[PDB]
Every structure is written in structure tokens, then in C-alpha cells.
């Protein structure tokens, strides 16, 4: 691909809601709270 | 256990438990400084020795000590509940400045030691009571009237309009 | 923790956006216009005091294309903002005001003078509306197409600084479309009943002249005030009816596509077919229009090409990777895709060209204010504000030493 | 029908109890003063505190 | 109750059996 | 690894209601009260566990 | 970590893709003709086509017969049943020799049973009956479905079951918050316990709180288990019977080995054939290794005649070092390998040869490497000469005592003096027999 | 061939490469950092708006669900009471 | 695999010492 | 920013129901936050502003001061220009203006040239300013003890390639790949 260096979404699995959420990347918003972003990937259905 | 739903009107304070159909405690949001300090239920009776202040003008909190006393009365007298053991849901007028919401959070957590808190817009809660996904809310409250458009439960702040007449000035007229 | 008690004011050509830093959206949005009455500016401010008909009250605009036209009326606009909408005395809150890049430097100086001397705010800063619009999208390398009622402009920004000489100005803006629909009204004879008199709705079927009555209590209104209100009516018409063709306007396609329905305040209603597609083509090609069709008129794609070309290739590739469209006129239905194809033809697709997605009314109008909110709460930015004790000499020397 | 389908009665996830002394997850509950605790030091501290409380009251 | 005896600890302070009077 | 509970039993109280009861266990340094399910109640009544005897309870089993 | 047995260096037959044995490869040196024959036999076994074929490995002791058999086992892998057996094993006090032989025959026939279980797993969020005014007339309270909400870590699914599942729902103590398994096919609810979320540290009951099922509600996929035909024979011969009088009485009596009838084995054959026809089972026939086959008696060989002619038999490898020996069970009948001539008639004989000194040296070096022993070339030559004098096993066995002596001496290598000293401490059969005479 | 010559003459000064790349370095500074803090905060703003719109949608739709389920529960209760009285009448008549 | 800590996107960290770097504004160097 | 996807996922404690965490919250209390005045050490003028902090960190320091780094600028007033920082085409006024402006815009050459005053001084291109800055830095280095022309060739090569009329773009790019 074009090799953009910032849009490093990746497959991730949470622990409490233990499931593969798909492409998600971690970020720190205001107040020091770690947030997971997400993509509505066309693979969304495959994660059943 | 239960969540405390304290609605801070502009002259009328409503309180109760989450899940109850009606606000059990309703008392006017009066606070009086003698000529101790007393809130509406007793303040309205103590006028002769008392001078009456309102902490909410037009839905926006005027000064924070009087509102502190209003909340103290609400909890400890009207509800008898311990603020440290219940989550608290506070409602504030639309277009409340950021500083006012922050001070509300500060007062709750610091002075009243609440475990969990939430501040929600009054108009969106009225829409929830109506039960409609999208709507326009005309809330002629106790001291100010607000026309709030809501799409998918999201209040559109740009379109909210304030007109500075409501029940109180209407009573004056 | 990066926030301070900052207020972001974004006064464009149509509405003034006032809100606190960190806020997702501007707190208030009320129009630039303001009322007048005989004695100074005996007054009427927002959409609530600017609309009730009154005995010979006249409406004016202290702004023009973003440059301040009357500083006393501007001061009173700000005074009412602080008094009611933000309802906080201004003596404590840092403020940053957005000015159009082509606004004069002397006007920036006079704005700082007014702000600090009269309102006695404790801090200040300036950053251009295009700079703030590119600020909202998080992009250093961006090209902005701002188009309000009174002016349409294209401005590139790199490293967060405007290419000050790379400014393109085009009156082909919301007022251009409004005049076009005005002449449409005249040619097919819409009688523009103002909503403020109507008191009955004896509506009629398509095309028929609706019946209605005017409220007896109405007093006389100056022509300027009636002009403003009917201009707002035709602005609503702009928003509702206008649509833009994907490709170059064609008569047979414009007739083929289904017509649309608009109803006027008095009950008069009409259906529009090819005219609504034709009108924005006037913006995209001034030649077909009446009068305002000289070769001097520059369309949107030509504007973007001119703005891109005037800057060298050390940043032009950056402009390629992001085209940002803001302002009112970009909300005409299917305007953004038409602009995208237009640039894809005008600008050689040989290298990497992308748009930047932004659609809703909040995102286009207030992207100028959203960037200001982003700056005001920025941690590093807190050092940049012009302090009052600094202002004592800064309002003259450092209002430029500091705010490029 | 009710005998065969009592249904309802939500499970009501318990409270993750904590030890007042060490603020550790609780794994014991003092039969006198059902305050939870996690360590023996916490137990003796809790019992001393109860003694002082009953002396005060 | 736990808080009838003892006393809440400020976040970041190590838990020690501070006891109300 | 076994992870057992040992203590002197101080009390086993009325289970009459599905039966529910409390068990108070005591070391020289601690005592705790346990809420007994049906299986544990049956085991305790089958062994005739009585106040003032030292038991060991295997948590896994 | 792992313990070094006498055959721990034998990893395969050491054949190239053409079927030819390398001089030394995969732990075997020399004996190329025998290794090539063993490769042919490995291909025969892998063909899974021929039943009851026998090969006899015949040669002097120490010529790699068991090494070759275990190399065959390694070549076939762990999936093919390899049943090793000594001829002395047939003399049981409990069962006859024929029964022991037949049981060992059934241990070399493997079976891969592939059963796909479909289960709906989760924590019961809701048990709600779906009421209807459905019946064929009737003023009663009717339900046409039972709604079960099953919650796993992945998600929640609402299952709608036959109303008849209400009986097992309370026969099992199934409530909301209980962990349950609903056989997709059987439709039988099964309360594993309660969810461990509803489990305080102050609760003493155990074996009641099970963790929330991981993954999807709908999954148990395929369970694959490998058994031998003897396992089925044994299981179906005496039922477990732990439920009633069988339980106490049978357990109380000693469980002797019984002489399973041909009727049971025929029934097991029929059942396995039906399992294979349904695709639930795969047959992997293996190889039976009878070492010291000369220890079998005439009755055992006569039975082997019939056992080797059945279509269900495995491949049998016989090892025998006997020169011309009286057959056990006969007084004066000598046949070549202690095996009757009529059993040798239905056997294919792979002959192993004595190793030359160089092959012995290679084997000794391989064994030293296997045992983690560093040996100098002089020590290796001297040990090869010792093996030429005495025997390969004797020289192979001096390696670890000599390595221990070197370690005691501060060395990490075996030198000539250490092997000489170990040779003086320990005697071989020849020298001991000279001393005895 | 013709392409080869056309590219050769053009490639002298006009094709096939941007001639060399400048190698001057640049120390990091305050404005670049402020622009990066910008980029991060704008990402935060957009993502927070997205979370708030989605959360308002989910919450208002769960409240609408609460109201609909409540109304259906009252209707079902009335119907069930009617059917229960009918079944009591049936049991007595039977 | 990606065998990383799916690193953070924090606010720009404060510098202990200079690290002279800047992207190519053209985003096209090759 | 995004590409029109699912909303962000945020940290939360009161997942479940504040019946789980009732104990973990009741046993602790908050560190008292205050609205406190501060002055950033990065500010040349000691102005003061407010912001929220913990009342135990009050007035400590501003962590963003470490982002206040600046790049150096040469110095010359009366004789260093003639002796070391010699010039024969640029006046002291033009050099000083360009240097002050470069500090303004932190040696970001493109916008530096964009501002470069075209009516107080004669016109010139970006690379002229870049190379002159290199020259001044070299001279400072000597007293205190890659090629601009190819960059102009760059600008012209890109201008020719892109200004290429669309049909010729297509044809040449075909010719580009064929051989
Ligand atoms: N749906 C619509 N589509 C397009 N234009 C609209 C729409 N609704 C209103 N407008 C007109 O578009 C303009 C709205 O943008 P506005 O003038 O507020 O921009 P601004 O952010 O102040 O920028 P500028 O500096 O270009 O004026 C006004 O002319 C408004 O009348
Ligand atoms: N060709 C060979 N290559 C490598 N090691 C071998 C070879 N032949 C035998 N060995 C090993 O040398 C030792 C002697 O061989 P064995 O297989 O034990 O003798 P054997 O011939 O199998 O015994 P019998 O008499 O046939 S039952 C064992 O450790 C074997 O693993």
C-alpha cells in the first residue's frame, strides 16, 4: 500500500469483553484516558 | 442502593431515586441568610428572621455556596441518603459554561464524596421521558425557557435558543 | 491537563461563533447582522431580538467579508455575547479571535486595541480563519476553500502558517447564489411574503397563488430590515432547493432528473427542475449567468488551481494530498463531489491527490471555530497568548511580533 | 406454570469486597463486625478498632 | 460497616488503618 | 498444590429454609464466617461437624 | 533430561528416496540389505492393504534385529500402532497363550474415531416461555417455545427450544446465571454450575462455580481419539458397571483377564466396519513385533498359523537368533530358528549379518554421540578392537562407565587408559566363561 | 526505438529522475511540537465527537426500547389478566 | 507475528535532547 | 482522524453496575483538585493563567516548558558583518530582516520566503534565502571555530512535468514505461 506511517490500526482482543474487535489502535485523549479507536473493516463479518 | 436523581430547577428542586416514577422530594430552591442557613422547606417558613436568596437564575447556577447548601439539604434532609453510597445524576441547563459543569463535578466529588456522578442536559432527559429518538424540546422551566433540537439524542448546541421569560417573570406580569 | 479558561470567537461573514476552549462545538451561533434604532446603536442583537418586527428599525452588518466595518457595533455584539450567551464577565477569560487572512494588519491592530483597552480581557491571540479550518482537521499540509455569504476564497496552509500572498478571492459565494435565486424569483414571479406578517394558511395546490392575511398590529419596518429577513428566507431556499450536477450542466439531463418541491411562507408552493442544477453551475462557470458572467469571474476549480499554482512545488505536493472545503457554499447538495471531479480534471491527476472528508453543518461552518478550540486548549500554545502586562507594548509591537 | 417457570430474578453480580486496612481484595469476613479483610494483621487491627468503637459507644 | 470504623484513604496514599474516633 | 482451609469451627447455625447456613472458622490469629451452599451443608451435616473441632476443607473438592 | 535406552539412537531406516540404504543414516550403520527389506516392509504397512503378513528377522545376536524393528516403528510414526512383545509374554496365569496372542494381535490394529459434537454453551441470561393461543382448542396456558439466552465471552444468543426442554430445565437446577450445555442434537440441558462472576470469596461450596464459557455459544467441534481393537474388545467384554450390584460385587472381586470369545471380536469387527462406512472412524492397521519368538511353544506357532491367515490381522515381525533349536513344547523336534517349518513357510526371512570392525566402530561412535560422550580416536580404535575380541554390546556398554571414570579423573573425554581400566574392572561372557572353566 | 530516442533526449534534463536529493538536516523545535500536539488534539476532538454521537444514539434508542417494552408489558399484562379470568371461568364451568 | 506492544499515540513527548528530524512536506521523496 | 467507522472505545469503571465496585470506591477518596494560577517558565514575560490541578502540585512547574526549545540565530551589529559576515549584494538591513523573519518562522524556508518582504527589498526565490543562510552559518562557524542549483533544476523539472498538457502526459507516460 501507500505505507502511511500513522494509521497503524491492528487486530486486537479485549479481556473483559473478550472478543476480536478488529482493527483498533490505542490513543491518549484529554485527561490521560487510553482510548481504542476502530475501523469498520470489510472483514467485520469474518470475526464471528 | 440506588442512584440519586437530583434535578436542579431554577426555583424548584426535584430529587428522588433512579427507577421511581415520580420525584419523591420536591422543595423550592430557596436559601436564606438570617438577618445558620435554611433552605426552602424551612426557609419559606422562616422569612421573618430570614432573607431569601436563589442560587439558580435562569437555570445557570448563580453562586456555589448557596447551591452547595441546596444539595446538602436535598441529600441529608429530603432524601436522608448518604451521598457516599449512591451515584448522583445532576441536571443542568443547556448552554451551561464549562466552568460551571467542572465546578459541579468538583463540589459533588469533593464535598459530598459521591462514588459516581453524571451531569445530563435537562432537555435530553425530557426527551427520554417523552420517548422519541429525535425531537425539538420546548422547556419553559422555572426561570428560563429553552428550545432544544435533539437528533438521535444528541442536542444540537448551535440551534438552542434561550428566551429570558418563564414562570417567574410571568407571575410578576 | 492542557486547558485554560479560553473563549474562541470566530466571526465570519454570516454568523458569530462563541464558545469555550475544549468544546466540541461552538456554544452559540447567531447572525452577524444587528439591529439599530435612533439615539447611538440603540439595539437588538441575536436571532430573537433581530426578527420581531418593529417601528422603523434598521438592520446593518458591522462586518464585511470578515473585515470589521463598525467597531462600536462589533463591540456591542461582543458585549451581548459576553453578557448573555457566555454570561461571564470578560475580565478573566483568555480569548483568541479569528480573522480572515486578507483582513488588514491595521485592522488587526485596531481590533487588539479595542479588545484590550475596553474589554480588559487578561490575554489574547489571533489566528486566521483558514488556519483554524485546517487546524480542525489536524493537517499541517492543507488547502482550504472558504465560501460564506459575502465571499468565496481559497487559501493554502503549510507548517500551520498561511502562504500570505497565496490568497484567491472570488465573490462567487453564497450571495452570488442568493442573487441568482433572487432573479429566478423575479423572472417566474415569486412574491416573497415575509413570514413575520402571515397569520393564516389558506394553502393552495401546486402553482396556485396562495391566500393569506397580514397581521393588523404590524408597524412599519425600514427597508433594510425587511431586506435582511427576506434574504434569510432565500438563504433557507438556497439550503433546501439548490443542487449541483456531478458533471458539466446539461439541459436534457437536468430536465430528466425528478423535480423537487419547495413551499413558501404564505402557502405558495412551486416545483423546480433544471433551474436548481443550472444555478450552481453559475458558480462553477460564471459565463452562463446574467451580468455576473464576465471572464473576470473565477469559478471554484479555477480558484483552487490558481491557489495551488501560485505556490512552488516544495509544498504543492502537500496541497495535493489534502483538499479541504469549508464554509456555507460547500453545503450546496453534491457540491463537494462536483468540486472533486472538477479538480481531478483541472489539476493533473498524475500525482497523489486526495480530498479530506467533512460534511455536516457543524463541521463546515464551525471548522473555523473548532480549530480555535483545538488551539486554545493546546498545552504548548498556552505560552503564546498576548498578556495584558505584555499587551501594554504588545498591542502595538507584539500583536505582530507574536501572531503571524 | 409459575412452579415450572419461576424465571426472572436477575443474578445480581456480587460486590468485589475490599479489606479496609490493606485495601486488598477481601478473602475473609470477621464474624463479629462482618467487615471483610485479607490478612491477619488486618484482622487484629479490625478487632482493636471494634473494641475502641464499642468503648466509645 | 467498613467505613463506620476506619477512614477512607486518599488515592495514592498507601492503605494504613486510619481509624475514626 | 492443594489450597486447603483449616480452622476450629466456632458455629454452624440454623439451615432451615435450598438450605443456607453460616460456618465460623477460627485460627489463633483469624476467624472468618463462610456462607454454605447445599453441597457443603450436606457434607458438614454428614460428618456431624460440631462446634469446637479442627477441620480442613479442600477448596477444589 | 531424557533417559538413553539401548535403542535411543535408532531414528529410522536410513533409506534414500529410491529405497536404498545409506552406509550410515538415521542412527543405523551397515546391514544395508536388511534395511532395504525393512523399507519394503514399511511400504507394505503404509499400504494398509495386506493382512497377516509375517517377516522373520533372523541372525546372530547383536545384529540389529530389534534395532531394525524399532527403526520400522520410527518410520511408521506414532500414528501406526506398534505393539512390542516378547515370546515369554504368552505364559499368563490368567488366560491361555492363544488369548494372549490374539489380544496382542488386536493391539496392533488401530482405530481413529472422529466424532463431531455440536453444543450450545453459555450462561443462562433468561428462561422465558413463549405463550400462545395456539392449541387445537383449549382454555389453558400454552407455550410453543422456551427462550434460553446463552451468554459466552464472545457474545449472547437467544435460543428457541422445543417446549419439552422445560422438563430438563428444572430437572437440572437451571436458573439464570447458571452455566449450561444444550446438546444441539440430543437437546438435553446440562447445568455445569454457576457462573464464577456470581462467586464471592466468602462462599464455601465448590465444584459449583465454573468460568464463563469462552468463544461462541455454538461450538464443540470434533473430538478425535485413537484406540486399538483390543481396547474395544476389553471395554465391551466386561462393562464398567459402576452403577449397581455390578459395581460393588465386581470391583470387590479381582478383575481377572478373560478369554474373549470370537463372537465378541466379530461383533467388534462389524461395529468398526459400520463406523468406517459412516466416516466416523479410520482404520490404521499396525505391526506386531514378537521378539524372542523362539520362546513361543508349538501350540503358539500352531495358533499363529490361523491368526496370520485372517483378513483382520496386522503385520507381524518375528525376531530369532536361534541356530537349530528344539521347538518349545516338543521334546526332540529341531527346526531352524526354533520355529516350525510350517510357520517359516508363511514368513519372509530378512537375514542380519555380523558387523565388520569398521561398522562396529561407527556404531560405537553413534552410541557415544547418543550418550553425550566425547571419545578420542585412539580410545575409539581400542574399543573397536575390544568389540572385535568380545562383542559389540560389551564394547558399547563400556562407554558410560569409562566416561564416569574420566569425569572422576577430571577429564571430559574417554582416553585409552580409562577404557583399559574399565575393561579390567568388568568382564565379558568369554572371559568369564574361561574363568569358570 | 523512437521512444528510446525521445526519452534519451528528454532524459538529459527533463525525465526519469528528480536530480539528487538535498541532505541538509534540521533540529526539532517548539512550533513543530505544537503542531504535533495539535494533530493529536484534533484527533481527540473528532474521535470524542464520534463517541458522543454514537453514545447518544445508543442511549436514546435504549430509552425508546425501554418505553416500547414497557408499553408492550402493560398490554400483555392486561391481556393476561383477561385470559386468566377467562381460564378461571372455564375451570369453574368445567 | 507485528510482534509489538501496539504502541501508544500519546501527546508529543517532552525532549530530553534534540533529535533533528522533519518529514518531507511533499511526502514524495524517493 | 477517521474514515467513518465505529465510535471510539473509552475507559470505564462502572461497567457492570456500581454494585461490583461499590467497595473499591467507598474505601478511597479523591485528591482535592483546585483551579490554580501558574506561570510557564517558557514564557519570556511572567504572565499567569489558570488551570485545573491537584492542589498538591500547585505552582510546581509547567511540563510543556521542555517543548520551548529554539534554534540559534547569528549576531552582528557594527563590525562583525564587515569583517567576518561579509556581503556584497545584501545590505545589513536585508540580512537582519531575513534573520529575524527566519526566527519568526523557525527556519521553515518556504513560508519564510512567502513572508520575505517584496516591497522593502528586491525579489528573490526561496533557494537564494536558503543558500544565503547556509553561507552565514558557515561564516559564523569559521569565526567561532546539498546543491541549490540542482534544487532550482528540481523546481523546473517538476514544473515542466506537471504543466505538461494532459494528452502529452498520457503519451509520454506510456513512452515512459514501454522501454
Ligand atoms: N444548506 C446550505 N448550503 C449552502 N449554503 C448555505 C446553507 N444554509 C445556509 N447557507 C449559507 O451559507 C453561508 C454559511 O456560511 P458562513 O457565511 O457562516 O461562513 P463562515 O464560516 O462565516 O465563513 P466566511 O469567512 O466564508 O464567511 C451563509 O451564506 C448561509 O446563508
Ligand atoms: N546396524 C546397526 N546400526 C546401529 N546400531 C545398531 C545396529 N545393529 C545393532 N545396533 C545397536 O547395537 C546394540 C545391539 O543390537 P541389538 O538390536 O540390541 O541386538 P539384537 O540383534 O536386536 O538382539 P536379538 O538377539 O536380535 S533379540 C543395540 O543397542 C542396537 O541398537
XYZ file of N, CA and C and ligand atoms in Angstrom, chain G residues 5-10 23-32 35 57-70 289 291-294 319-322 352-353 355 359 362-364 366-367 391-394 396-397, ligand 2:
196
model
N 18.122 -45.236 26.303
C 17.988 -46.678 26.210
C 18.919 -47.215 25.128
N 18.998 -48.542 25.038
C 19.905 -49.158 24.080
C 19.528 -48.849 22.638
N 18.271 -48.491 22.374
C 17.800 -48.201 21.027
C 17.385 -46.747 20.851
N 17.915 -45.835 21.665
C 17.514 -44.438 21.581
C 18.184 -43.701 20.430
N 19.193 -44.295 19.801
C 19.826 -43.714 18.626
C 19.134 -44.100 17.327
N 18.263 -45.105 17.354
C 17.613 -45.603 16.148
C 16.412 -44.711 15.852
N 25.119 -45.943 3.788
C 26.086 -46.625 4.641
C 25.771 -46.370 6.109
N 25.525 -45.113 6.459
C 25.115 -44.757 7.812
C 24.146 -43.593 7.713
N 22.975 -43.736 8.324
C 21.969 -42.688 8.270
C 20.889 -42.979 9.298
N 20.465 -41.933 10.004
C 19.389 -42.024 10.986
C 19.677 -43.098 12.033
N 20.937 -43.174 12.460
C 21.324 -43.994 13.586
C 21.678 -45.429 13.261
N 21.518 -45.858 12.016
C 21.837 -47.216 11.602
C 23.039 -47.198 10.670
N 23.941 -48.159 10.860
C 25.122 -48.314 10.024
C 25.141 -49.738 9.489
N 25.530 -49.886 8.227
C 25.629 -51.207 7.658
C 24.271 -51.886 7.601
N 24.311 -53.207 7.442
C 23.094 -54.012 7.364
C 22.185 -53.528 6.240
N 22.783 -53.084 5.133
C 22.028 -52.360 4.114
C 20.912 -53.214 3.526
N 18.030 -53.343 5.914
C 17.317 -52.070 5.993
C 16.473 -51.826 4.750
N 13.018 -61.736 11.289
C 14.379 -61.229 11.320
C 15.259 -62.292 11.961
N 16.184 -62.841 11.183
C 16.998 -63.972 11.602
C 18.470 -63.621 11.471
N 19.224 -63.847 12.536
C 20.643 -63.608 12.518
C 21.250 -63.798 13.888
N 22.573 -63.757 13.970
C 23.231 -63.881 15.265
C 22.787 -62.770 16.196
N 22.861 -62.979 17.507
C 22.501 -61.904 18.433
C 23.392 -60.687 18.239
N 22.801 -59.512 18.422
C 23.522 -58.266 18.279
C 23.671 -57.767 16.863
N 22.875 -58.273 15.922
C 22.973 -57.903 14.517
C 21.915 -56.878 14.114
N 21.244 -56.270 15.088
C 20.344 -55.168 14.812
C 18.910 -55.543 14.526
N 18.478 -56.751 14.889
C 17.106 -57.155 14.602
C 16.103 -56.247 15.304
N 16.265 -56.051 16.614
C 15.393 -55.121 17.320
C 15.651 -53.686 16.905
N 16.903 -53.344 16.601
C 17.177 -52.023 16.056
C 16.383 -51.797 14.780
N 16.346 -52.797 13.899
C 15.598 -52.668 12.654
C 14.098 -52.583 12.908
N 13.581 -53.380 13.845
C 12.151 -53.318 14.143
C 11.762 -51.955 14.711
N 12.583 -51.409 15.605
C 12.275 -50.103 16.173
C 12.488 -48.993 15.153
N 5.339 -56.835 16.903
C 6.739 -57.233 16.967
C 6.884 -58.295 18.048
N 9.453 -60.379 19.601
C 10.853 -60.664 19.851
C 10.959 -61.937 20.675
N 12.051 -62.666 20.477
C 12.237 -63.961 21.123
C 11.084 -64.899 20.771
N 10.732 -64.916 19.484
C 9.659 -65.780 19.018
C 9.961 -67.240 19.310
N 11.236 -67.591 19.468
C 11.595 -68.957 19.825
C 11.100 -69.341 21.213
N 11.539 -62.007 15.497
C 12.982 -61.970 15.671
C 13.439 -63.256 16.342
N 14.498 -63.858 15.807
C 15.002 -65.114 16.344
C 16.487 -65.239 16.051
N 17.273 -65.483 17.096
C 18.703 -65.722 16.967
C 19.068 -67.194 17.087
N 18.084 -68.083 17.190
C 18.369 -69.493 17.419
C 18.910 -70.154 16.158
N 20.126 -60.855 9.066
C 21.062 -59.852 9.542
C 22.444 -60.475 9.664
N 23.465 -59.686 9.361
C 24.823 -60.181 9.239
C 25.701 -59.588 10.329
N 28.702 -57.650 11.975
C 29.289 -56.383 11.576
C 30.800 -56.506 11.455
N 32.173 -51.179 10.832
C 30.778 -50.945 11.186
C 30.605 -50.874 12.696
N 31.729 -47.492 13.803
C 30.711 -46.488 13.515
C 29.570 -46.559 14.523
N 29.133 -47.773 14.862
C 28.052 -47.937 15.831
C 28.478 -47.413 17.195
N 29.727 -47.671 17.578
C 30.226 -47.206 18.867
C 30.282 -45.686 18.899
N 28.373 -43.672 17.115
C 26.987 -43.214 17.158
C 26.439 -43.324 18.574
N 26.737 -44.432 19.248
C 26.282 -44.628 20.617
C 26.913 -43.611 21.560
N 32.525 -58.596 21.805
C 31.205 -58.464 21.195
C 30.863 -56.981 21.127
N 29.901 -56.647 20.265
C 29.520 -55.249 20.088
C 28.859 -54.686 21.340
N 27.963 -55.454 21.961
C 27.271 -54.961 23.146
C 28.256 -54.651 24.266
N 29.239 -55.528 24.479
C 30.212 -55.302 25.542
C 30.951 -53.987 25.335
N 30.038 -51.424 23.493
C 29.089 -50.319 23.583
C 28.807 -49.976 25.037
N 28.852 -50.966 25.920
C 28.485 -50.751 27.311
C 29.620 -50.194 28.158
N 23.089 -51.749 12.251
C 23.121 -51.121 13.428
N 23.378 -49.795 13.444
C 23.410 -49.160 14.618
N 23.221 -49.656 15.843
C 22.965 -50.968 15.796
C 22.900 -51.758 14.662
N 22.617 -53.073 14.996
C 22.523 -53.048 16.303
N 22.717 -51.809 16.853
C 22.681 -51.459 18.266
O 23.659 -52.235 18.935
C 23.087 -52.880 20.092
C 22.964 -54.358 19.827
O 21.887 -54.578 18.902
P 20.530 -55.240 19.358
O 19.464 -54.843 18.414
O 20.223 -54.950 20.829
O 20.792 -56.792 19.264
P 19.662 -57.706 18.661
O 20.149 -58.429 17.466
O 18.477 -56.779 18.389
O 19.184 -58.725 19.766
P 18.485 -60.032 19.305
O 19.411 -61.250 19.593
O 18.237 -59.914 17.775
S 16.780 -60.267 20.220
C 21.774 -52.150 20.351
O 21.976 -51.015 21.184
C 21.338 -51.743 18.945
O 20.516 -50.584 18.967
